[PDB]
């Protein structure tokens, strides 16, 4: 391995072959695992030279070595990615996308993915320089199976970075231009391509209903539900995130998730050994139980109420809090019969046990659910039985003790429950 001084000496030689050998030495330095001297290379002023080498069409080896060196610098901190951008690398890398050498074109795809992945500013700057058209042109083949596997994975990952980040979200016209190609990748049978395609879809659905509608209006929901039942965790995780984002939109958008058969996967999702899967699946359920009464009935018909009782009874606390939200949304919009069925499944006891949690909001969420269930019992004239049930679980002790909680939203709800149904 060369020293930085010897690399600088070789690059300043104005001997193209000496510059090639020095650039390759810099690339090997930047490719080591333990502490690549990225800042030393930047401080030596080598980035503008590397960028100049990207345009030497007659010497494709130095194009590849400098692109690889710049890619490793752009993969570091935001200051290091900025130094690559400040060297003029964005238009130079976009020109390299048309290289007849696949390994050079792939290196440009890789570098632009690192630059765009820094944040919304560099993402939009890459788009302004016109990267989308040559990127999509590399995928303009009738069957993606004819492309090299690693080449296709790099293009998918880079496209997903162009869909990533908010404040602001990517430009609408850029999303519309990318979506048809993204849908192709979402149907390609390669685990890495599927994972990164799902991540891109999860980014595009993380926004207002207009953004969700753009994705739904491509027919990807059935494929997302199919990927939701995959065996690879790197696929289920972004697929579930995308589904969870879609059910935060309108009730019609939520209905297409249900029509695609998503609720049949949730018995295994709500009992998944991975904590994050259970949390996001319960979060997804909370936004479905916030829908119409016929959609709440879909949750009931798929046998998912006992699974919500289970998650509320025993899970990580963050998952249990998502379950409390699911119950409050359920009891807020459900019919009297649906609320009675929820109590019959045993929701009361695990609901009262969580009134001992230190989190303030979950106490308010539970007290709202208890209030909604009493209103269903008032319509049936069965408030006395519910008060007994809440009593025998030890819940009356907690509702009574919650009157000297400091938060003012808790004593009001606790006192109003004590007055109206107990005292």
């Amino acid at each position: 391995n060369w020293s930085v001084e010897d690399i600088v000496k070789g690059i300043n030689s104005n001997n193209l072959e000496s510059q090639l050998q020095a650039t390759q030495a810099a690339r090997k330095l930047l490719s080591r695992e333990k502490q690549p001297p990225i800042d030393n290379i930047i401080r030596a002023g080598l980035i503008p030279k590397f960028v100049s080498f990207l345009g030497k069409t007659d010497c494709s080896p130095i194009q590849f070595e400098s692109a690889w060196a710049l890619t490793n610098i752009a993969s570091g901190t935001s200051e290091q990615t900025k130094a690559v951008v400040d060297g003029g690398a964005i238009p130079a890398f976009i020109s390299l996308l048309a290289s007849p050498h696949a390994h050079i074109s792939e290196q440009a795809v890789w570098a632009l993915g690192n630059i765009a992945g820094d944040g919304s500013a560099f993402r939009d700057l890459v788009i302004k320089h016109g990267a989308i058209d040559p990127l999509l042109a590399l995928l303009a083949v009738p069957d993606l199976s004819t492309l090299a596997c690693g080449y296709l994975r790099n293009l998918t990952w880079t496209l997903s970075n162009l869909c990533r980040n908010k404040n602001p979200a990517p430009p609408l016209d850029a999303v519309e231009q990318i979506l048809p190609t993204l849908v192709r990748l979402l149907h390609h049978n390669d685990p890495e391509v599927l994972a990164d395609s799902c991540w891109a879809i999860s980014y595009l659905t993380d926004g207002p209903n207009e953004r969700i509608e753009m994705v739904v209006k491509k027919g990807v929901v059935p494929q997302l539900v199919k990927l939701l039942g995959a065996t690879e965790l790197p696929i289920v995780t972004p697929a579930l995130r995308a589904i969870g984002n879609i059910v935060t939109g309108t009730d019609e958008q939520t209905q297409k998730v249900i029509d695609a058969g998503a609720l049949a996967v949730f018995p295994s999702l709500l009992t998944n050994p991975k904590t994050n899967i259970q949390k996001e699946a319960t979060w997804t359920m909370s936004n479905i139980t916030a829908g119409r009464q016929d959609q709440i009935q879909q949750v009931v018909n798929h046998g998912l109420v006992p699974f919500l009782v289970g998650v509320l009874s025993k899970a990580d606390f963050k998952t249990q809090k998502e379950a409390a939200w699911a119950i409050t949304n359920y009891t807020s919009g459900g019919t009297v019969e649906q609320i009675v069925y929820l109590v019959h499944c045993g929701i009361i006891e695990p609901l009262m046990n969580l009134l001992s949690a230190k989190d303030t909001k979950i106490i308010q969420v539970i007290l709202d659910a208890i209030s909604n269930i009493f209103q269903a019992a008032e319509k049936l004239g069965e408030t006395e039985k519910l008060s007994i049930m809440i009593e025998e679980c030890g819940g009356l002790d907690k509702i009574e003790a919650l009157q000297r909680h400091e938060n003012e939203s808790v004593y009001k709800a606790s006192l109003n429950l004590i007055e109206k149904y107990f005292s």
């Binding site: 935060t248 939109g249 936004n287």
Partner: peptide
Amino acid sequence: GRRTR
């Protein structure tokens, strides 16, 4: 309601 998060 829906809790975007």
